[PDB]
């Protein structure tokens, strides 16, 4: 059976997105529990988040057969991983975040539009720094 | 301007999913670099990943006004956060992972099917442990 083109490929991508968001959400919830003084709850959110890291990385390992879910490019070696990170980052800073900022401004959300513009600049920095590292890579 | 129902709400959800995945992907890439001996590259993936945590958590802060992107439910306090986590985990073990497992088996990916079944069981454990924590919450 060929994973490329299958429903199972799409399910792995969806589940990877879900596990990734679960870790982020659980760490955000841990920080809320921190401030409240709910240290036992915070520790449980953190421990569960480690589980979601293991799940997401297992999904990504299967996706090595088909490509990085963010870009379609192969991944595995540092050279490949940097090239994929660069392509994804370039999309975020040239297209995704500028477009989101425009939509937010048009809809009346000036603070959110400025946030998206801050993130476009931040992803441009990430893209350039990864490109510098790729040029310096000796493998 | 009301965030609920807007294109900006959908963009925050999409950007939250993207930043979450970027952190997970960059830490996976860092582990690849670790094994290769590319320690400077690994450190860069880790530092960039901290940036993506800050971005994702900023997106989530805006989404507090409309609901948890995984469940649609309120979030903020530990009680709310545990409630939303339990609902999401319950969806994962009663619906999402079992259905992904069946599709994998039907398509001939027996190992991936077994992986989805392991995760269904793990998410059920997560749900039940969060429920025990909510039962004990004093707030
Ligand atoms: Mn999980
Ligand atoms: Mn970035
Ligand atoms: Mn980012
Ligand atoms: Mn879980």
TrEMBL record, chains A, B:
Q: Which domain of life is it from?
A: Bacteria
Q: Which residues bind Fe(3+) 2?
A: 52, 89, 123, 126
Offer an example of a GO molecular function term for this protein.
oxidoreductase activity
Protein's UniProt keywords contain Kinase: no
Q: Could you tell me the keywords of this UniProt record?
A: Metal-binding
Ranges where the Ferritin-like diiron domain occurs: 2-139
Pfam families for this protein: Rubrerythrin
Q: Which PROSITE patterns match?
A: FERRITIN_LIKE
Provide the residue positions that the database annotates as binding Mn(2+) 2.
52, 89, 123, 126
Q: Which SUPFAM superfamilies match?
A: Ferritin-like
Q: Which residues bind Mn(2+) 1?
A: 19, 52, 55, 123
Q: Which InterPro entries match?
A: Ferritin-like (IPR012347), Ferritin-like_diiron (IPR009040), Ferritin-like_SF (IPR009078), Rbr2/Nigerythrin (IPR052753), Rr_diiron-bd_dom (IPR003251)
Q: Where does Fe(3+) 1 bind?
A: 19, 52, 55, 123
What is the designated name of this protein?
Rubrerythrin
């Amino acid at each position: 059976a060929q994973l490329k083109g299958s429903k199972t490929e799409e399910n792995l991508k969806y589940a990877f997105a879900g596990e990734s968001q679960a870790n982020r959400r659980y760490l955000y919830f841990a920080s809320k529990a921190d401030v409240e003084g709910q240290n036992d709850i915070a520790a449980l959110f953190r421990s569960t988040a480690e589980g979601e890291t293991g799940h997401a990385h297992g999904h990504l390992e299967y996706l090595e057969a088909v490509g990085d879910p963010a870009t379609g490019l192969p991944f595995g070696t540092s050279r490949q991983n940097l090239q994929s990170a660069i392509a994804g980052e370039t999309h975020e800073y040239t297209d995704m975040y500028p477009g989101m900022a425009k939509t937010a401004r048009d809809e009346g959300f000036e603070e959110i539009a400025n946030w998206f513009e801050t993130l476009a600049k931040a992803e441009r920095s990430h893209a350039n720094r990864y490109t510098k590292a790729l040029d310096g890579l000796v493998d």
